[PDB]
């Protein structure tokens, strides 16, 4: 559905890019749908119709997605490449078409077929309400991490100092 700021990713957390939001699964988990994560299993006979990958069952991708370069991408994003970003589904247009969503610091370039070759600002809209967490840009995406000067204490999984 519509992955928004209020979406609660089950067994996962929220990330933000230039023009959309997504759910990223904790540890080594996989996405069964857009908002829930479950443990991914190579597939065997006992593991039939279990998650073999992101949006994939048994290892073929789910309806609407296609296995492109060892991962599952929506069918409308088959041949679209953005470079400093990723292809997503255009929410506004009814025929959902592959449009580019860029990493933090880049925006779609009008003089480059809306590819991620233009430097631009992206304001983080994530509400990091957890203890001593704020929105920070980690590896080109926004995510909820410990605030300035705090380290996650593995004894409690909380940001302390």
């Amino acid at each position: 559905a519509k992955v928004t700021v209020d979406t609660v990713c089950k067994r996962g957390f929220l990330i933000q890019m230039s023009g959309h939001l997504e759910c990223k699964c904790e540890n080594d988990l996989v996405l069964v749908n857009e908002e829930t994560c479950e443990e991914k299993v190579k597939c065997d006979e006992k593991t039939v119709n279990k998650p073999c990958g992101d949006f994939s069952k048994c290892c073929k991708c789910n309806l609407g997605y296609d296995m492109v370069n060892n991962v599952c991408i929506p069918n409308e994003c088959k041949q679209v490449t953005c470079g400093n970003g990723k292809c997503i589904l255009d929410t506004s247009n009814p025929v959902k078409t592959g449009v580019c969503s860029c990493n933090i610091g880049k925006v779609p370039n009008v003089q480059d077929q809306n590819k991620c070759s233009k430097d631009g600002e992206t304001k983080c809209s994530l509400k990091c309400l957890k203890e001593q967490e704020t929105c920070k840009a980690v590896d080109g995406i926004y995510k909820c991490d410990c605030k300035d000067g705090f380290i996650i204490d593995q004894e409690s999984s909380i940001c302390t100092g």
Partner: antibody, heavy 120, light 105 residues
Framework: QVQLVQSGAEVRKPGASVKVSCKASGYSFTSYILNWVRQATGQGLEWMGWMNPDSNNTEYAQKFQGRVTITRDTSISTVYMELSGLRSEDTAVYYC?????????????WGQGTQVTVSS | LSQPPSVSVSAGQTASITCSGDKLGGKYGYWYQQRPGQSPILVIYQDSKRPSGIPERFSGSNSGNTATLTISGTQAMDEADYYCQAWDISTNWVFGGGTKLTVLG
């Protein structure tokens, strides 16, 4: 530490060109974009353009009709701002400041300023 | 961006400098202090954050069409020109008109 050091003050005649430099140290040059801001004695800060040393791409202000030319030199970690067709409007102090769209820091560090005077 | 040209505050009181824009709530707000003769310094970045060395008396807010800079207990060393900044897609970097903060008393 991180420092942005510009060239010295210059005086130019109406119609000539002026080329101001900006030296960068203490940080990865290609990581941040270097802007150019000027300010007349009366008025406030006015953005004119920037140079991204990672992509060699420049963006200029519409009001500066092809007169601002920003060229880089990552060898010396120096960006140059050349202004042509000088008029009385160009008599101002010129600043270079860096910013990151990846870290969203704004103009965290500025230059020392270069006062360019346009007189006969 | 639009700022009031002059703002006077009594010494020790709270001064508020507003910055109005088209859709400023969706942009990051940056505030700069410029004393006469020298270069401006960043005092507030990312709407509400302050860089290291800036006293805790400087605060920032940004929502809707107004971004406000608030200084509690304004001192004599705060009389300077405060500028507003935000990045727009069409015109890249935009500065505010300025604000001369006068500390009375």
């Amino acid at each position: 530490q991180v420092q942005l050091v510009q060239s010295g003050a210059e005086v130019r005649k109406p119609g000539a060109s002026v080329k101001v430099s900006c030296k960068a140290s203490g940080y990865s040059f290609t990581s941040y974009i270097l802007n150019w801001v000027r300010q007349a004695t009366g008025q406030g800060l006015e953005w004119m353009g920037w140079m991204n040393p990672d992509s060699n791409n420049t963006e200029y202000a519409q009001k500066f009709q092809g007169r601002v030319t920003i060229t880089r030199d990552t060898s010396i970690s120096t960006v140059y701002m050349e202004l042509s067709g000088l008029r009385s409007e160009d008599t101002a102090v010129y600043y270079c400041a860096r910013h990151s769209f990846k870290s969203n820091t704004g103009f965290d560090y500025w230059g020392q300023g270069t006062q360019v005077t346009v007189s006969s | 961006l639009s700022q009031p040209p002059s703002v006077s505050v009594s010494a020790g009181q709270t001064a508020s400098i507003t910055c109005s824009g088209d859709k400023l709530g969706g942009k990051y707000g940056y505030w700069y202090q410029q004393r006469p003769g020298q270069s401006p310094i960043l005092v507030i970045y990312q709407d509400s954050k302050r860089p290291s060395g800036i006293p805790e008396r400087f605060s920032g807010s940004n929502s809707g069409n107004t971004a406000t800079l608030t200084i509690s207990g304004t001192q004599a060393m705060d009389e300077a020109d405060y500028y507003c900044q935000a990045w727009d897609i069409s015109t890249n970097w935009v500065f505010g008109g300025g604000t001369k903060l006068t500390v009375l008393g």
